[PDB]
Every structure is written in structure tokens, then in C-alpha cells.
Design a protein around this ligand. Structure first.
Ligand SMILES: Cc1cc2nc3c(=O)[nH]c(=O)nc-3n(C[C@H](O)[C@H](O)[C@H](O)COP(=O)(O)OP(=O)(O)OC[C@H]3O[C@@H](n4cnc5c(N)ncnc54)[C@H](O)[C@@H]3O)c2cc1C
Ligand SMILES: Cc1cc2nc3c(=O)[nH]c(=O)nc-3n(C[C@H](O)[C@H](O)[C@H](O)COP(=O)(O)OP(=O)(O)OC[C@H]3O[C@@H](n4cnc5c(N)ncnc54)[C@H](O)[C@@H]3O)c2cc1C
Lengths: 465, 465
């Protein structure tokens, strides 16, 4: 054409890198094959899952908690699953259409089709309309993302053997559902359907669910899931075989064998980096054994002028805000500015109820690294707001360097953990000590006071516990 | 006895000062006349109001919003006002009993009765059980708080002419209710009853409600109150007379006269510092013309060894977290430590729905002070989480010094503003610039991203708007 930058992939990583590059003055194009912008996150990930977790949480509260507050008739509330899915699609549509508008507003040229490398500076676009085009550019950002990991002996058919995409689109509540993989995606998607009536069983190979989190955190979460959603957990369990019977699945597991039968199986064991059809081999962009594109500190691949960000790269966790910050940083670097991402401060949130939010290091990691640390913990059953509205589950746990009082990690389990973690992120970005946070005035009554007091438990004593 | 410190008043200010002083090693006693600890806030303020706002918000959502998400039958939900009040009392009881335990745990000696000064070092306690005692102490902290301002021509009877205490305890929904004073207490309490069916009219002397807030903020709030609670507002209106008819009230107002009739009148024009029965005149502790106890930078009154904190003093806003931080600081100062409160960073939250949270300066103040500032504003109708769950009201507004990028004020209107403001408080406590917050990774999707992006609109451009 020629372009200054061509971004392949329109997910959180690519659409943000595209807008930021355009804003910085670069002639930018974004190639996306799906037919809609927003990538995995907006279309079949972040957004539809949070939309269904919200609607189902309202439903659960009406049935389980309304009476405690004086509300009668909650038992009469039912969920029209077709209308529920329709609102979810409406929400997704509002966001994906919004990104197209931002592209127009920022003058990003949008190509609908699959992008492939011809050379490090020429990209072939196989248009969705059949037409082919060759893009010439100075720089290219690979933001092709990831896809669900399939079990080789039980391929997805998105009818009974489901990936997260199929599970988000079920037209009716399954009677029974088994979830393989007790990670963030399995727990969120299992909660959606368990709230509406499905008998859900989670099968996890590790000793406990969300193995990346400390045991006191996952304990608080699984205890709530077992009590409220009535989910059943089978940890230290391996899946050894299975059969797709067309309208049900038979799974064989072992902890001693056993067979489980379910109407719907959600396989959420992991996600793998996706570079299919990209032509990386043609230009020799290096990948590690897991298939991730290898990058350096400035997002550069092994090939000059070709960069990569988001889920496809060998750095950081596979999360949307990580891809978004890498997109901004990469665009800034391409414009001659000093961009960078702080990989030591990337939060992770589980939108179950209660929610779980973490940033920084876990105790398991500090123990592994031999760091001497102090723990400040404040339970929500002692917090003013949580007691006032009767949603007392969870706690805030702050880990500090026993020598310098610096905050090393913050973990929160409570109804509003996702929004509380932003304060902890800013604290860590700044290298704050527990005393810095503890001496800041927090509004009363708020759940953020539990963060203030857990910090006070580190450098002094908490007041309300 | 003798004591190192005697605290008169067991509200947020006194009970926290008592625990902190005890923790620091001082032999401490707390004198409280009410019969329960927690002061205004726990007993007839913060807690019961947030408990009713929560229950009524669930009720409103069931009727107004359930259908949009696919939940049917929300129309059949009713509120048993007796059970609603009973849960509120349960919540209050759990918190006030908890403070008594903290006193026991910390070895604070608790006297139930009215405290009065005999001399600057001897306090008479008129016990609730009739018995009198004399306390001798080295230092005294006055934390006697405040009380509702009464209209001289329409005294409270807590039956039809109500203060916030009477409005929180109504046994049934009034048909009509007029609220005099469109401030935080009137708006929260008016929302509670409007949600349950009362026709509520707010009468405010100022041009707009919550006059302390910027017009774009109050506009967003009053527009929601008018639409959802169907509240009617009469601003620039003066109350000139009234008659308590026993089972109704007739109010005469003027903007041209007019008479309004209501079943219940909430007078929430303000609160005044309370020092009744304290004997301040006997020891000459100085008060300003409004009745506030005058204090210096270390909370000292005009009389050596006598200090004061909380609602009763001539400093800061009348808020619980302010009293609590003054209590900690004062206790620290009495133990020989350097305590202090940062009055420029005290947040304020309105727990209506949407919520409003502010910290730092408003635009009206910056204009008044001639500060050259930049405004970054991001609306929630462009935020990932708000769109995903369809609760798009409000925005985040960040005010920065146009010269140094330093954050001067943050104002938020949205469903979760109260918990979001803690991040803004830490930012200001640290003297952060908008770029500092804008470059921090915030989890996606969260409403906290609107704060990140409003900051980005100051030093650069937002991405999603
Ligand atoms: C069910 C689910 C829920 C999730 N929830 C959350 C959450 O709440 N918060 C969170 O932080 N993360 C969440 N994630 C993870 C999140 O979706 C990812 O971290 C994220 O999308 C990072 O993505 P990206 O831009 O690198 O990838 P992308 O979103 O995956 O990449 C997407 C795109 O690249 C395009 N593409 C690939 N190859 C080509 C090509 N050759 N030519 C043209 N286009 C191509 C694809 O069509 C697609 O649109 C969730 C994931 C799932 C599956
Ligand atoms: C309806 C309502 C809702 C509110 N909501 C909030 C909110 O959500 N957040 C917020 O920050 N603020 C809120 N406030 C304001 C909050 O209650 C005050 O800022 C707060 O209580 C500051 O108080 P304190 O310790 O100084 O006063 P206190 O709580 O008022 O003082 C209370 C005590 O002093 C005792 N006392 C007085 N004189 C004597 C004496 N001579 N001897 C013994 N005892 C004595 C009284 O009995 C009482 O318990 C609210 C107020 C009201 C009325």
C-alpha cells in the first residue's frame, strides 16, 4: 500500500496495538479472519463468560439469599435460557461493533481475511470474500492468540464434547456436566451451569483446583462452590479414556478406575498458542517447543521487523490485560518511544462468586524462593461493609518482605475482589510497603478497608480484628 | 483508677482511638452513654443505612432489571418490611457486639454512662445503673460526635417529623415522603423508601442536590434517581413553615408559595457537633461559633492534656473514616509517636445506585482557586465490564494539574464507585500523575479500567473511547 505497521490478529493484543500505533502517527492496518474484531476475549471468552456469570449470579441470589434480606418470592424466579443467551449476544455485539468504530475513528485500515507471511515485509491476505491481496509494510506485529487444547482421544464436536466456546453457547441447561481442568475457565463455566441446575463435577489432575493459587485461597473458593453451586470435585484424578456416544459422554477416570456419564463434557485443560496458516516457517520466525513465538524485551521475534504480543508469545500469563499492555508497549516501541510492561505486576481475577483476585507472588512461590516474608490477613467476616450487607465470605491476604515491609503479593477472596485488586496493583507498581497502604484513608464502610487492615496487620496490628 | 487515657464517646473516632491507645501500651478507658458501642455510624448511621440500601437495591433490580437478563418472575417479588428491618438489626447487632469483644481483647476498660469534666484531669461518670464514679487520667480524648440539626418550627417526634434515626426505623413504607436537604443522607434515605413504593420529593435550598459535588456528577446521579426511583426534586426551594398534624405533615415552601402534604417528613438539613452535658464550660475548652471543639495539628484543644477527634472537631468532613484515622493518629501522638492525617485525601461515598465516590478537589474548587487543570473523562458505556453486565450508567472524571500531570481530584459515578475510589486515594496519597495510573496494568474486564483510561485521556489518549 505501503504500511508502517501491519497487525495480524484483532484480539485485545492486536486491536489495542493497532489503535495505539495509529494514534502515534503510524499508517496501520489490522488483518483479522474471524469476521468480527475483539478476538477470543470479546467474542467467545471474557465478555460472554462475565455476562452469563452476572445473569446466573442474580438468579442464584434470588433463590438462595433473597429471603434473608426480607425479599419474598425469590423461589418463583426462573431463567429463560434463550433470553439469557440473547442478552449475552447483545452485550457481545455492542462491544465488537464498538471496536470497529474505534478503528474508523483512529483511521486503522481493517482487512477481513487470513494473513500469511510471504516475506518478512509482505503479507498475503486471503480475503473472506475470496479476493487476495498483498500488503507491503515496514513492521509486522503477530497477535494471533491461542486456541483450546483438545484431548486427542475425545475431539471437540461442540455438541457434547465442548470447548469453552461450545459451553458458552448451550441452548439449554444440561442435566449433568463434567468439567476437565479445575482452572479459571472450568470453574467459571462450571459455575454458570451449576447455578441453573446442572449437576457439575470438576476433574482435576493436580492435588487442588487453580493449583497456581495458594491453598488457603483455593480452599475458600472451592468451599463456597461446594456449598452454593453444589459442585463436586475430583482432584488427583486422571482422565484415561472416553467415548462420545452422540447424546452423552462416557469418561473413564482414575485416582483405581471409574466411569462417569454426562450429558455435556467441558474440556478446559489449557490453551495453546495459535500460528496456524501464518507461514512462520516460510520466514523462520523461531518458536519454542510449546509453539509459542519467542520474543525479546522489546517484543521482537528472531526475524528483524517482525514482533509478537499477547497469548502467542513465550512471556507472561495468557490474559487479556497482559496482551493489551503488550500491544500499547509494542506500538510505543515501534514509534521510537520507550515502552515496557511490568510482568511482576499483572493481576489475575476469577469471576466466580466470591471472586478471587491476585497480584504479585503467592506464598508457595515465596517459600520456593526462600524469601522471608510476613503475612497480614483480614477476614471479611470482620469487615464493616461485608457484615452490613451480609456477604462475609473470604479474606484479604497481604505478603510482605519481612525485612523491608515491601508488599510482595496480595490475594483477595470476596464478592468484589476484581475491583479491589486495582488498588493493590498500583501499590506494587509503586513498590509500596504495607505501612504506605495501611496509613492511607479508606472510605468507611467499604470492603477496601480489609486491604487497609490486612496491611496494618503487617507493620502494626489491625484494629477491627 | 488512674488511667493514661480516657476517651469520651464510643463511635468510630473513640472506639478506634481506644483500641489503638491500648495496643500502644496505654491504660485506657472508654466512656459511652448509649448502651452500645459504635456510635452514630454503627447504630443509626452508616451500617443500618447501607443494609437497607442493599436489600432495597435487590428488590428494585428484581422488578426493573431482571427481565433484561432473561430472569422471569421478578414482578412477583415483594418486600416484607418487618423481616427487612429484622435483618438490618441483626447486621447492626453483629457489629456492635464485635466492638465490645475487641475492647475485651485489647483490655480497654468500658464504662457505660455519661462522662463529664470535673477538672481537666478528672471525669465524672454518671453510670446508666445510677452509680457515679470519678475517673482520674493523664490525658482525655473528646469523641462525642454529632446529632441531627432540628428545624425549630417543626421539632422531631420521630413519628412523622423524622431525623435519619426515625427514617431508618419506619415499620412500613410511607405513601408519600418529603426529604428536606438534598445531601448524602437525604438522597440515600430517600432512595430506600422510594424503591419500595413511596412517592418521594426532595426539597433543597441550593441550586442543585449534593452542592459540594460538580454539576456533571450530580447531574448523572439525579438523572438516575429521577428515572429509577422516580424521585421528584425541588431545588432552589426554601421551607418557610409547617405543621405536624399528627399523622401527616403540611409543609409550606417557596421558590411564590406552595404547600406540600406528606405522610412522613425526613429533615436531613445537617448535623451539629455535640458536647451536651460534657462540662466543657467548666474547664474552658474553646469552641467556635458553630459549636465545634477547636483543635490544633496534634488534636489538642485549648486545654493542656485534653484532645478531640471526629465529628465534634473543627477540621475535615463529618465522615466515619475521617474520625477513625484521627483516632489512630491521636492515639499515636499520645504514645509519643508521630501521627497525622492527610486531610487532602479523605474520600466521600454516596451509596445510592449508581454510587458516587470522590476524593481530592472538584472542578468548582479548582476554578475558584484559579488552578489550570486538564480533565480526563471516560464513560462507563464504553467500559468492558459495564457493557458486559449491562450496568452502563456514569463515568470516571480525573482532574490533573495541566503543568505537572499530578492528579488533583477523582470523581466516579457507577455501580461500584465506593470500592473503586480506594485506588484513587492511594494514588493521591502518593502524589501520582495520571500517567503513573494509566501505565499500571489493570485487570480486564473491570470497571477499574475506566480509571486507567480516564488517566490515559489526560497524558495521552484513551484507547476504548
Ligand atoms: C472462556 C474464556 C474466558 C476468558 N476470560 C478472560 C477474562 O475474564 N479476563 C482475561 O484477562 N482473560 C480472559 N480470557 C483469556 C483472554 O481471552 C486472552 O488472554 C486473550 O484473548 C489474549 O489474546 P490475544 O489478542 O493475544 O488473542 P486473541 O484474542 O485470541 O487472538 C485472536 C485472533 O487472532 C485471529 N487470527 C489468528 N491467526 C490469524 C491469521 N493468520 N490471520 C488473521 N487473523 C488471525 C483470530 O481469528 C482471533 O480473532 C478468557 C479466555 C477464554 C477462552
Ligand atoms: C444516617 C447516617 C448515615 C451515615 N453514613 C455514613 C457512611 O456510610 N460513611 C461515613 O463515612 N459516614 C457516615 N455517616 C457519618 C458518620 O456516622 C460520622 O461521621 C461518624 O459517626 C463520626 O463520628 P464519631 O465517632 O466522631 O461520632 P459518634 O459516632 O457520633 O459519637 C457517638 C457517641 O458519643 C457518645 N457521647 C456523646 N457525649 C457523651 C458523653 N458526655 N458521655 C458518654 N458518651 C457520649 C454518643 O452516645 C455516641 O455513641 C452517617 C451518618 C448518618 C446520620
Amino acid at each position: 500500500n505501503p504500511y508502517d505497521v501491519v497487525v495480524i490478529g484483532g484480539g485485545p493484543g492486536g486491536y489495542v496495538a493497532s489503535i495505539k500505533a495509529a494514534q502515534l502517527g503510524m499508517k496501520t492496518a489490522c488483518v483479522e479472519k474471524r469476521g468480527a474484531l475483539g478476538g477470543t476475549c470479546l467474542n467467545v471468552g471474557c465478555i460472554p463468560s462475565k455476562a452469563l456469570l452476572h445473569a446466573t449470579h442474580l438468579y442464584h441470589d434470588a433463590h438462595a439469599n433473597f429471603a434473608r434480606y426480607g425479599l419474598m418470592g425469590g423461589e418463583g424466579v426462573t431463567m429463560d435460557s434463550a433470553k439469557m443467551q440473547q442478552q449475552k449476544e447483545r452485550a457481545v455485539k455492542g462491544l465488537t461493533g464498538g471496536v470497529e468504530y474505534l478503528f474508523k475513528k483512529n483511521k486503522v485500515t481493517y482487512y477481513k481475511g487470513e494473513g500469511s507471511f510471504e516475506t518478512a515485509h509482505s503479507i498475503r491476505v486471503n480475503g473472506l470474500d475470496g479476493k487476495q491481496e498483498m500488503l507491503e509494510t515496514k513492521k509486522t506485529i503477530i497477535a494471533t492468540g491461542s486456541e483450546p487444547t483438545e484431548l486427542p482421544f475425545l475431539p471437540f464436536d461442540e455438541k457434547v464434547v465442548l470447548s469453552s466456546t461450545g459451553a458458552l453457547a448451550l441452548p439449554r441447561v444440561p442435566k449433568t456436566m463434567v468439567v476437565i481442568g479445575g482452572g479459571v475457565i472450568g470453574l467459571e463455566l462450571g459455575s454458570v451451569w451449576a447455578r441453573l441446575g446442572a449437576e457439575v463435577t470438576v476433574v482435576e489432575f493436580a492435588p487442588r483446583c487453580a493449583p497456581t493459587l495458594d491453598e488457603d485461597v483455593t480452599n475458600a473458593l472451592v468451599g463456597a462452590l461446594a456449598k452454593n453451586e453444589k459442585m463436586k470435585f475430583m482432584t488427583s484424578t486422571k482422565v484415561v479414556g472416553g467415548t462420545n456416544n452422540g447424546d452423552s459422554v462416557s469418561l473413564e477416570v482414575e485416582g483405581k478406575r471409574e466411569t462417569v456419564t454426562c450429558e455435556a463434557l467441558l474440556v478446559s485443560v489449557g490453551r495453546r498458542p495459535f500460528t496456524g496458516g501464518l507461514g512462520l516457517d516460510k520466514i523462520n520466525v523461531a518458536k519454542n517447543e510449546r509453539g509459542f513465538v519467542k520474543i525479546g524485551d522489546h517484543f521482537e521475534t528472531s526475524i528483524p521487523d517482525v514482533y509478537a504480543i499477547g497469548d502467542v508469545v513465550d512471556k507472561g500469563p495468557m490474559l487479556a490485560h497482559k496482551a493489551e499492555d503488550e500491544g500499547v508497549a509494542c506500538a510505543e516501541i515501534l514509534a521510537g518511544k520507550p515502552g515496557h510492561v511490568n510482568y511482576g505486576v499483572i493481576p489475575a481475577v476469577i469471576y466466580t462468586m466470591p471472586e478471587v483476585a491476585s497480584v504479585g507472588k503467592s506464598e508457595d512461590e515465596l517459600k520456593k524462593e526462600g524469601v522471608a516474608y510476613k503475612v497480614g490477613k483480614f477476614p471479611f467476616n470482620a469487615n464493616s461493609r461485608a457484615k452490613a450487607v451480609s456477604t462475609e465470605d473470604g479474606f484479604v491476604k497481604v505478603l510482605v518482605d519481612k525485612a523491608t515491609d515491601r508488599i510482595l503479593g496480595v490475594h483477595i477472596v470476596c464478592t468484589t475482589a476484581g475491583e479491589l485488586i486495582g488498588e493493590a496493583c498500583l501499590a506494587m507498581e509503586y513498590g509500596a510497603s504495607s505501612e504506605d497502604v495501611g496509613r492511607t484513608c479508606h472510605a468507611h464502610p467499604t470492603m477496601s478497608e480489609a486491604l487497609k487492615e490486612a496491611c496494618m496487620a503487617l507493620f502494626a496490628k489491625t484494629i477491627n480484628f
